[PDB]
Ligand binder design. Structure first.
Ligand code: 25V
Length: 127
């Protein structure tokens, strides 16, 4: 019923790059999803205490959210675009794993995921 530590957003010994694909993930992908009317539940880690979801972290063992993604991108946490893509996909998947079809939160995730897919379809070739 308690919250875990959040995911890492800083690790000085993890090697880092700033690639055109990662820049796109920040300037296009994250910015597009973040501004969306359905972004708010996904803008920070799930607070299973305040939301009274005492089983959330019993079920979701790889938590991820756009707050975490945003910090990762802004602090050049990643080596490659696939790492970041995997974070978005983890976020969507968790939502679908925890919730039931047609729950509001699932429709919200689906709307963001549609946009995500459209933006990833035009990830630029590496420079
Ligand atoms: C800090 C925090 O947890 N905010 C928040 C606000 C509203 C909804 C959610 C939320 C977010 C997510 C990802 N899921 O799956 C939920 C499931 C059931 C109830 C609520 C949620 C999170």
């Amino acid at each position: 019923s308690m919250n875990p530590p959040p995911p890492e957003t800083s690790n000085p010994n993890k090697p880092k790059r700033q690639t055109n694909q990662l820049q796109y993930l920040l300037r296009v992908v994250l910015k597009t999803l973040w501004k969306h009317q359905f972004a708010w539940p996904f803008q920070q880690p799930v607070d299973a205490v305040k939301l009274n979801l005492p089983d959330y972290y019993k079920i979701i063992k790889t938590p991820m959210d756009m707050g975490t993604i945003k910090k990762r991108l802004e602090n050049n946490y990643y080596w490659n675009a696939q790492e970041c893509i995997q974070d978005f996909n983890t976020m969507f998947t968790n939502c679908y794993i925890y919730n039931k079809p047609g729950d509001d939160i699932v429709l919200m995730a689906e709307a963001l995921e549609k946009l995500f897919l459209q933006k990833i379809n035009e990830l630029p070739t590496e420079e």
